[PDB]
Every structure is written in structure tokens, then in C-alpha cells.
């Protein structure tokens, strides 16, 4: 018949089958993270089996329907899925040291050492023993020797496999039709849908550098008030007009400045709103915070959590013996079935990421009407926006009073209010220009508009630029510090963590003006608007069955990124920012080193 | 009248082979069937639950099988999707009920049950009440198949897996369908 036709009758075959096999890896995988068992790893790894090796005969399959032959673009979109295969291309002696060096460069990242030079046994995995200086320490030369020490022994060994790496990957996506690796990757915010929802791998970058211009000046802002609070800390080591020097920065790496908050919060004689107190003292279990999670979800208008969710979910850390691995997961298994995995405590934290995982289970159920390959989100950023709003608005002063954890008289002073939106600033704000920047470098080098002779150069060029962060030690061309980052030497994708920031305030701000809250975005609560509810659902349950732009215009409007609603978020915080400023320097040189002299 | 070897029977059949009962010459209380309320689906055509009660009629079809719980939908005159499409087909002039209760304690295990089967792909929809129980190779394109699968080549019959912690719509469904005849013959 026609190619569509055809194309039609194999899909069907495919879903039926494909239902099956990815069904019952769930099922295994849920039985071993519930009880890590020799076991379990073994019926794990064979249902993996299965069903990776379906997947990949059908992906071949699934080539021979050409998608110029084919009209609907339901059909469209499920083949296309399909036919992103990968590395198949690659021949066997290619392809098997590809895997080869990925293997590699993971193992020497998850086992390498450091050694201290004041004492040779003091050596020190990355977890738990250099990210504890590199979150703690407030000692320049320890944290100095933590960052150099890493980014020396296991960055320089990395520096050969990722040159390989970057060669044979490109190999791969050229005889893809892609331009680079990169062009790749880019590839999951292709959209050719229809009408205007078109959307170009090359658009990626023009949005990524349009909107990120948008968001420097609050960046600028907030990166001189954290370099006069951290003269009063490290005095010999910091220049009032220079960059920061990466190694002091609250991580390994400087993604994010959440634990500089000690340092730098603006009013500290004032404590955080912490909820967990109360709720203690109301006695609150695990059942009582996953049971206010779905109230919420409710009060908005989307379903319950099913009775499986209850009976089959694991909300808390078993104690019969069953060893079990207890990162919070949101669980889509398959033919209805839907569970969380926590360890849930009595704390406000936990209270939070419920909400958090609550949501991917809401996104889940609703797109459940999807055809298999369009169950998911409409790109990689949207699963993981829609479960932080939820975290917003539960986190609120307003809803927390609602559920009876603030005493109904509670009032936020203007000083705690600050100090709430500088840390949430230290976190969402300082890891854009950290996100941007790493993933630019990697895709001018997929690119090969950085050769090796510069890699490092351009590396420490950009981090001063953009980032305004500046290396405690020069670094040549033997090192390979962006490899020393877990994403990089993991072949993982990073612009997701910058989109689905900026996603995750349009989704709160449209919401927020649909069940017409009035006064400052950051203290929004979506409970008991219907309205919200609907207008959310319009989007989650299309999951990838529409191209991005579509899905994004059904719940803010607009097909494409705008950072207002994230500037909207702050700018309480903005203009108290601007005010400490105004005797100090807001910028950088990108000259000075603390290596200069 | 013995309904209850049909709706109790121990085992059921897949939806493709569906099995077919003829109740006459029989006293025929529905009362007992209307008043349990296991049943989740119970709806009439035609005829009046209540007044059936007192209706005689020329003779009785109780057709039973299993489906998944999102489809007992489809077992309703005027339905379309796979299964009513290619697996059981009520006419449009359909006088009878449709009975359906969760089968999920019974008829799904852990690890899965398989054994319950839905036809797949077809040339053509089903006449009412026909019952295809055939298992050639699908050709769904110019190439023939030579009773073997292939490229757009599919055997036709798929099996649902039954697990009890699947979601309700992906739960094991026990149907009996009731067919009433009412003329061109004597009553019963
Ligand atoms: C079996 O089902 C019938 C319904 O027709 C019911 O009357 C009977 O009570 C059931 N069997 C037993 C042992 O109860
Ligand atoms: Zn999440």
C-alpha cells in the first residue's frame, strides 16, 4: 500500500511489542532498586536485554519508511523517534573503542584520588572527600589544592580520551547527515511541526545568546555583590574589579554558588522559613506530606494518585532488611502504573521534592493517551520545569499557612524575603553562565573552531569572560578540566539545565496570571485555581506529540524562550542588588589572575 | 436457566475465540444477575434491566472473554477500535446486555499472565458476531509472506500482559455478553 500505510501497520506491531518489553525493564528495575540483590541485578540486566535489542532491530526497521513518503505527522514524529539510533553507524573496530574510551573515562572520573601534599594518606575520592572541602572549606589553600589536585590527576588523564572521543563522536554524527556532535545534540529542540511551531538545531544557539545577554546584567549584579562579600573572607586572594577565582566558588567546580549562602547572605540575624519544626510537632509521617502533595494537585483540578501509586510506591526507607537505593525517582512503569521511590523524612525538604516528584507523575498521566513513542516530555527541559513549579508554589509562605504549617499571623519581613531570593539567586541565577558557558565550549570544539593547540586557552578564555571566573593556577594544554566535570566525561548533554530554567519561569508566571494572583511572582501559589489546573493539562498531556514551540505556546502564549518571567521572579532581589552596588565595581576584568604576580 | 456456569466458569477465553453459550428451554431469573454488584459495567439495549425480568424471548446467547479494562468500552453497538473492529463486533440493532467486572485477582499474575490474546491486524472488520480464530501471517504489503513473519509480514494475534499492579485501564476485564431474540421463532 502506501509508505504510510505501511509505516502505520509497523508502528502498531512496534507499540504492542514495545509496550511488553519496556513494561516488564521497569518492573525488573523497580524490583532491584527496591531490593539490590545479586539477583535482581541479573533479571534487571536480562530485561534490559531484551528489550534494548528489540529496540535497536526496530530502529533499523524502522529506516526503511521514508519520512518525505509520509503524510500525518503523528506518524511522522513516532518514526522519527525511531530512526535516531546512534553509533550503529560506526563501523565494529570504530565503534568498539568508542565504547572502549566512554568506559574509561567514566571509571578513572568515579575512582580517581587526590592526595593531600601536607599528608600523603589524606587521599581523597571526589565523593565524599574533596566535595566536602569544596562545599565547606573557607581555607583558600585547601580548597586550592582540592581544585588544582583533581582537575591535574584526573583531568590530564582525560585529555587523550577526550581528544579521541571528540574525533570518533563527530565520525558518528557526520554519517548522520549532522554537521558535529554537537549539531547532534542540538538535534532534541529540532521541531518541524506544523504551521510556524518550526524550530531549526541552528535557532538553539541565536536563543541560548539572545536570552542569556537578557540575563547578564542580574548575573553582574549579583556576581559583585558575592566578590565584596568574599573580599571580607579571602582578602589577599580577591581583586574588587576581577574576576573570582574558581576554586572558592561552593562546588568542585563553581556550578552552583548555593553553598557560598553562609558567606554572603544578605541579613544574617534573620532564619530561614523552616517548616520542619511544625512539622514534627504535628506529628506529620510520610503518608501525611505525599497525602498534601496530591490535596494540592486537587485543589488545581488534576486527578488523584492512583490506588497502585499507594500500595506499590516505596515513600519510605524499608526496614526489613531490603537494601535499596534511595535517590528521590518519579516512576512511569508502564500500563498504568505510576510510583515514587523516596526515603521520605519528616522535613521541609522532603515535604518539597514530594511535590517535586508528584509532578513528574502528574506530567506522566496525563500524556499516558500518547502513543508510546510520544510519552515524554516535548523536550528534555519541560519534565523537570513542570516539578520545580510545584516546589514553588508548595514552598510558599501563603500555601504553607493554607496547610496549617504557619501560624495563621505569619508575616514575611522584607529582610527574610531577601534572604530567600538571594540563595534561590545562588543556586538558579549562578549556574546560567556556568551552563552556557561549558556547553558553548563543547560545541565550538564538536564544531572544530577550537583545535587542541587552544582547547585549554579558549577554555579558561570564556570562564573569565562569560562566567567571570578565573583560574587559581594557569593551566596548558595537558590538562582537560571541562572533562573533570561528571557530564562531560559521561557523554551527557548540559544546555537542559539551562532551558528548562528559563521554561520553568514562563510555566509558573502564566500559570500565576491565570488564577490571578496578584503581587511579587516569587510568592505565587497556583492552590485552588482550576483555572491553572486546565491550562497546565493542555500542555502535559500532549507530551511529545507536538513539536516544543506548540506545547509551550498551550500554557504561556508564546512559542519560544523569553527570560522576563525569570527577571520578573527577581527583581525584588535586583534592585536591592543594584543599591549595595553602587560603591562598588559591577563587571570584571578579564586580565587579572591571582597567578599574576 | 444455568448462568451461572458461564459468568462463575472457572476459566474464560481470549477475546479472539470468544466463547458462546445457548441458554433455552430455561427458567431465566435477572434478578439474581442485577443484584449482585460486582459488576462494573451492566448496561442494557433494548431491553430494560429491571423489565427484563418479566420478557420472555426465543432463545438466549451468552458470549464470554476477556479484555483489558479500557476496552470493555468497545463491547457497545456503534463502537470502533481493535477490538471491536477485529476481535468481537455487536450489530447496531444489538438487543441485549453488556456485563463486565475487574478480573485482576484471578486473572493476573506476577511476572505476567500471557495467555489471554487480542487480534492485532486484519484485512477487514468483523460481521457481527463473527468469530475469526484464524492465525495466517498478515501481509501488509505487495511482497508476500510465505507463512512466515517478515518484512511487513506480522502474525496477527498479540498477547496482553497481566500484571496486578497495572493501572485499572490495564487490568484484566471478565465480559459476558447477553443476546436476546425476540421474534421469528417461539419463546423460550
Ligand atoms: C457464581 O455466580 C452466580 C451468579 O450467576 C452466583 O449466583 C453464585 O452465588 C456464584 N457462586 C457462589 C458459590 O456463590
Ligand atoms: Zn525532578
Redesign the interface.
Given at each position: 500500500?502506501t509508505t504510510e500505510?505501511?509505516a502505520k501497520?509497523?508502528l502498531?506491531?512496534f507499540n504492542?511489542?514495545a509496550?511488553?518489553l519496556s513494561?516488564?525493564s521497569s518492573?525488573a528495575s523497580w524490583s532491584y532498586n527496591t531490593n539490590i540483590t545479586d539477583e535482581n541485578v541479573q533479571k534487571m540486566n536480562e530485561a534490559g536485554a531484551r528489550w534494548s535489542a528489540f529496540y535497536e532491530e526496530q530502529c533499523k526497521?524502522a529506516k526503511?519508511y521514508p519520512l518525505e513518503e509520509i503524510q500525518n505527522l503523528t506518524v511522522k514524529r513516532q518514526l522519527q523517534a525511531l530512526q535516531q539510533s546512534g553509533s550503529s553507524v560506526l563501523s565494529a573496530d570504530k565503534s568498539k573503542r568508542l565504547n572502549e574510551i566512554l568506559n574509561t573515562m567514566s571509571t578513572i572520573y568515579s575512582t580517581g584520588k587526590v592526595c593531600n601534599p601536607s599528608n600523603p594518606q589524606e587521599c581523597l575520592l571526589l565523593e565524599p572527600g574533596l566535595d566536602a572541602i569544596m562545599e565547606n572549606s573557607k581555607d583558600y589553600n585547601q580548597r586550592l589544592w582540592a581544585w588544582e589536585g583533581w582537575r591535574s590527576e584526573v583531568g590530564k588523564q582525560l585529555r587523550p580520551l577526550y581528544e579521541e572521543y571528540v574525533v570518533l563522536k563527530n565520525e558518528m554524527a557526520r554519517a548522520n547527515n549532522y554537521e558535529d556532535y554537537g549539531d547532534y545534540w542540538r538535534g532534541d529542540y529540532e521541531a518541524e511541526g506544523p504551521s510556524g511551531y518550526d524550530y531549526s538545531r541552528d535557532q538553539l544557539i541565536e536563543d541560548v545568546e539572545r536570552t542569556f545577554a537578557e540575563i547578564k546584567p542580574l548575573y553582574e549584579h549579583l556576581h559583585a555583590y558575592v566578590r565584596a562579600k568574599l573580599m571580607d573572607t579571602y582578602p589577599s586572594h580577591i581583586n574588587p574589579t576581577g574576576c573570582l577565582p574558581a576554586h572558592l566558588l561552593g562546588d568542585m567546580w563553581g556550578r552552583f554558588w548555593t553553598n557560598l549562602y553562609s558567606l554572603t547572605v544578605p541579613f544574617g540575624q534573620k532564619p530561614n522559613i523552616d517548616v520542619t519544626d511544625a512539622m514534627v510537632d504535628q506529628s506529620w509521617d510520610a503518608k501525611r506530606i505525599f497525602e498534601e502533595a496530591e490535596k494540592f494537585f486537587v485543589s488545581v483540578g488534576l486527578p488523584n494518585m492512583?490506588?497502585?501509586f499507594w500500595?506499590?510506591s516505596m515513600l519510605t526507607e524499608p526496614g526489613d532488611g531490603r537494601k535499596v537505593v534511595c535517590h528521590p525517582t518519579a516512576w512511569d512503569?508502564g500500563?498504568?502504573?505510576?510510583r515514587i521511590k523516596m526515603c521520605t523524612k519528616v522535613t521541609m525538604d522532603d515535604f518539597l521534592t514530594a511535590h517535586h516528584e508528584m509532578g513528574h507523575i502528574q506530567y506522566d498521566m496525563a500524556y499516558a493517551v500518547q502513543p508510546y513513542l510520544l510519552r515524554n516530555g516535548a523536550n528534555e527541559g519541560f519534565h523537570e520545569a513542570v516539578g520545580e513549579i510545584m516546589s514553588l508554589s508548595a514552598a510558599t509562605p501563603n500555601h504553607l499557612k493554607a496547610i496549617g504549617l504557619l501560624p495563621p499571623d505569619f508575616y514575611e519581613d522584607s529582610e527574610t524575603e531577601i534572604n530567600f531570593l538571594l540563595k534561590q539567586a545562588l543556586t538558579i541565577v549562578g549556574t546560567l553562565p556556568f551552563t552556557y558557558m561549558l556547553e558553548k565550549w563543547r560545541w565550538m570544539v564538536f564544531k572544530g573552531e577550537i583545535p587542541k593547540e587552544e582547547w585549554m586557552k579558549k577554555w579558561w578564555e570564556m570562564k573569565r569572560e562569560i562566567v567571570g571566573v578565573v583560574e587559581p593556577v594557569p593551566h596548558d594544554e595537558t590538562y582537560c578540566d571541562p572533562a573533570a566535570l561528571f557530564h562531560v566525561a559521561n557523554d551527557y548533554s548540559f544546555i537542559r539545565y539551562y532551558t528548562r530554567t528559563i521554561y520553568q519561569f514562563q510555566f509558573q508566571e502564566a500559570l500565576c496570571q491565570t488564577a490571578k494572583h496578584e503581587g511579587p511572582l516569587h510568592k505565587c501559589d497556583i492552590s485552588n485555581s482550576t483555572e491553572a489546573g486546565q491550562k497546565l493539562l493542555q500542555m502535559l498531556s500532549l507530551g511529545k506529540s507536538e513539536p516544543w514551540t506548540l506545547a509551550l505556546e498551550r500554557i504561556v502564549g508564546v512559542k519560544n524562550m523569553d527570560v522576563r518571567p525569570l527577571l520578573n521572579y527577581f527583581e525584588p532581589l535586583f534592585t536591592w542588588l543594584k543599591d549595595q552596588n553602587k560603591n562598588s565595581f559591577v563587571g570584571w576584568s578579564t586580565n587579572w589572575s591571582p597567578y599574576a604576580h | 436457566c444455568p448462568f451461572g456456569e458461564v459468568f462463575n466458569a472457572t476459566r474464560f477465553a481470549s477475546v479472539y475465540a470468544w466463547n458462546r453459550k445457548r441458554i433455552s428451554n430455561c427458567v431465566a431469573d435477572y434478578s439474581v444477575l442485577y443484584n449482585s454488584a460486582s459488576f462494573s459495567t451492566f448496561k442494557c439495549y433494548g431491553v430494560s434491566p429491571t423489565k427484563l425480568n418479566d420478557l420472555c424471548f426465543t432463545n438466549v446467547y451468552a458470549d464470554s472473554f476477556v479484555i483489558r479494562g479500557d476496552e470493555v468500552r468497545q463491547i457497545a453497538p456503534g463502537q470502533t477500535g481493535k477490538i471491536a473492529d477485529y476481535n468481537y463486533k455487536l450489530p447496531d440493532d444489538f438487543t441485549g446486555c453488556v456485563i463486565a467486572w475487574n478480573s485482576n485477582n484471578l486473572d493476573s499474575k506476577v511476572g505476567?499472565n500471557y495467555n489471554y490474546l487480542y487480534r492485532?491486524?486484519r484485512k477487514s472488520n468483523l460481521k457481527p458476531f463473527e468469530r475469526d480464530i484464524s492465525t495466517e501471517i498478515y501481509q501488509?504489503?505487495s511482497t508476500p509472506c510465505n507463512g512466515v513473519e517478515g518484512?511487513?509480514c506480522?502474525f496477527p494475534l498479540?498477547?496482553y500482559?497481566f500484571?496486578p499492579?497495572?493501572?485499572?485501564?490495564?487490568?484484566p476485564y471478565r465480559v459476558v455478553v447477553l443476546s436476546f431474540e425476540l421474534l421469528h421463532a417461539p419463546a423460550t
Open positions: 500500500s500505510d505501511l501497520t509497523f502498531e506491531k504492542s511489542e509496550e511488553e513494561h516488564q518492573l526497521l526503511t492512583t490506588q497502585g500500595e506499590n512503569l500500563k498504568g502504573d505510576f | 505476567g492485532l491486524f501488509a504489503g518484512f511487513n506480522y498479540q498477547s500482559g500484571q499492579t497495572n493501572g485499572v485501564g490495564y487490568q
